[PDB]
Amino acid sequence: SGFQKMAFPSGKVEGCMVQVTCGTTTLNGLWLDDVVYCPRHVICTSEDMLNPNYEDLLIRKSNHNFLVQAGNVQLRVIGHSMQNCVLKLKVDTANPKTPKYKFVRIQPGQTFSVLACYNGSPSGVYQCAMRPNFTIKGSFLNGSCGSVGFNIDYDCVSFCYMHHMELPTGVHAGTDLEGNFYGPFVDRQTAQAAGTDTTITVNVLAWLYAAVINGDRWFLNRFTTTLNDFNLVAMKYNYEPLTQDHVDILGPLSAQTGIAVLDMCASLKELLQNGMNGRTILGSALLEDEFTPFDVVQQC
Amino acid sequence: SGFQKMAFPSGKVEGCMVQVTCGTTTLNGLWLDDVVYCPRHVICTSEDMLNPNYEDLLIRKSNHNFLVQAGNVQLRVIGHSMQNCVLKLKVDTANPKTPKYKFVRIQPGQTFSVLACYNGSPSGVYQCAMRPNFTIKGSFLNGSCGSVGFNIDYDCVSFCYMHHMELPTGVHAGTDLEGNFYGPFVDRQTAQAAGTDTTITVNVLAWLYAAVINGDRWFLNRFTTTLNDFNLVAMKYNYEPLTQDHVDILGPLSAQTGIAVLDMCASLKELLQNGMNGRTILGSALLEDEFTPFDVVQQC
Numbered sequence: 001s002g003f004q005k006m007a008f009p010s011g012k013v014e015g016c017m018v019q020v021t022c023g024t025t026t027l028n029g030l031w032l033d034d035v036v037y038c039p040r041h042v043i044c045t046s047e048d049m050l051n052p053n054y055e056d057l058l059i060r061k062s063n064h065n066f067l068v069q070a071g072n073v074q075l076r077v078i079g080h081s082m083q084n085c086v087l088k089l090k091v092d093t094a095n096p097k098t099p100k101y102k103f104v105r106i107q108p109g110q111t112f113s114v115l116a117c118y119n120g121s122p123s124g125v126y127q128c129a130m131r132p133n134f135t136i137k138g139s140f141l142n143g144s145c146g147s148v149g150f151n152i153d154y155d156c157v158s159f160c161y162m163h164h165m166e167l168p169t170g171v172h173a174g175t176d177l178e179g180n181f182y183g184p185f186v187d188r189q190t191a192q193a194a195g196t197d198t199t200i201t202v203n204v205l206a207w208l209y210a211a212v213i214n215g216d217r218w219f220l221n222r223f224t225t226t227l228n229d230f231n232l233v234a235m236k237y238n239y240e241p242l243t244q245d246h247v248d249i250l251g252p253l254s255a256q257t258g259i260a261v262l263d264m265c266a267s268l269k270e271l272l273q274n275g276m277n278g279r280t281i282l283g284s285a286l287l288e289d290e291f292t293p294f295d296v297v298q299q300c
Numbered sequence: 301s302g303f304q305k306m307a308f309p310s311g312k313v314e315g316c317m318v319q320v321t322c323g324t325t326t327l328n329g330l331w332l333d334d335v336v337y338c339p340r341h342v343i344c345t346s347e348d349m350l351n352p353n354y355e356d357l358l359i360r361k362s363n364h365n366f367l368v369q370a371g372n373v374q375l376r377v378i379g380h381s382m383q384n385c386v387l388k389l390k391v392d393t394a395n396p397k398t399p400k401y402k403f404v405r406i407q408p409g410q411t412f413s414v415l416a417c418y419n420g421s422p423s424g425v426y427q428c429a430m431r432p433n434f435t436i437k438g439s440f441l442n443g444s445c446g447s448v449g450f451n452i453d454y455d456c457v458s459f460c461y462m463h464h465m466e467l468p469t470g471v472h473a474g475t476d477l478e479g480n481f482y483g484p485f486v487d488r489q490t491a492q493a494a495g496t497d498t499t500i501t502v503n504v505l506a507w508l509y510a511a512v513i514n515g516d517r518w519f520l521n522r523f524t525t526t527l528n529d530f531n532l533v534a535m536k537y538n539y540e541p542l543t544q545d546h547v548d549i550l551g552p553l554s555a556q557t558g559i560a561v562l563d564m565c566a567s568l569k570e571l572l573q574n575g576m577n578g579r580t581i582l583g584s585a586l587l588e589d590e591f592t593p594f595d596v597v598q599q600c
Binding site for chain 2 (some may be wrong): 170214284
């Protein structure tokens, strides 16, 4: 059949992307209805970025200070309100390309597509995961700020992410659409570490199911284990522990492959302890934790 | 900065995708202007798929035999002509969503985005490479046939690929838009091997430049080599040989990193011969040959 990393089609979102300007700085904004959502740090200079008093910095801004472009067309900002770390700009015009949408806050391990932009024009799409330490491994250059992550269900767009900053370590932190940072991060220029990151156990499992489906299987073993004895080897190898909820999530996959979750665990535990001695699995030489159980189904 | 595999935004194409039906079988079609392009095997049963006499099979089909849907809307087929392995269906209506486009035949090693569909409705997008043996590693289920590969330059869509079949080995073969198979393949149900596949040398290089840009570098060594002595170790490890054209292609990257192509080669040669002894490079434990030099630039 085949199995690769795969993003939701980006169209529906592409028609919500707008450029937002305020002084020197310009960045990407999400135009839904007669609101335009963007990162609030748009209203900062460099001076301000070391220690911004944002409430102070707003209010001293009038609507006309905010430029919004939708192609070669100008929205007029008629109101402006801040919501945590998002600026929201009410405009005179509703977006005729608004899809059915909602705002969700995702959970660590959940995936989404990112449409990454520069100057309110889409450059590219890729699929991502919300790491345990609330960071994301992606690609984001200058001007990429305000690029969003989403999922599509039937034809409802669930916005989950807005990009804000690149942490020294080369990875990206951002907010949901209500303006709250995933992780303990703050929009200011000061050296912020995400903690040590761990692997998304339940996903790696689902990867091993996918593998077995598309016909790989060398890594399967004789053994089985308890969920506890397993976990005790999980924690040792920077894997997130595995709940019963997680086991439940793997029930369908388990049922299809005729392989019990705790056996899969035993086969995984073994890989952790012996490595892959030069072998590959779905032609990767690493354990892929960025496919959720749900992702694997939909593709399969 | 960051570096991940990244597809062109799919919108522009999503509005060219149509469902095409003929008897039992239904598949994806590309609607540009008042033509709709699709794989010709749509006109086959299973019987016919063992050894199809396509010229025979057409002509005995009238226009009304061809159903085309564009959302919940019906195009009327008013002419039908075959071009090698594509059926082309003239319709009463031009596609108001046709973008600026062209048809290109790509070369092995060139990349493109695939928008993969089922029943003329887009399910997902991913980035791909035209392997040396003219196959592609992708994801394509039943009904995925007629899913296209493309590149965008500014706002011109260069169609390069149409999907036809999955070869036993789990990989996918298809045509350009003029209906000619990349590779020595034919649209019939008979066991066809692609030859042994090799690695895209020039791309792997560009990957090593990207790496060095985003700050990795452990794999750099003291040595240098000749292009010949290099090649003689390339051929041994299933790498495509490296022309002067390829060296020329890496000139810009070389100039940025302050690292001469033949030194990079020496550093690569060394990896080939010693492996990666547990290390990673841009967090992959393999050599990534599916980013062209051009791709790396645009992202960077």
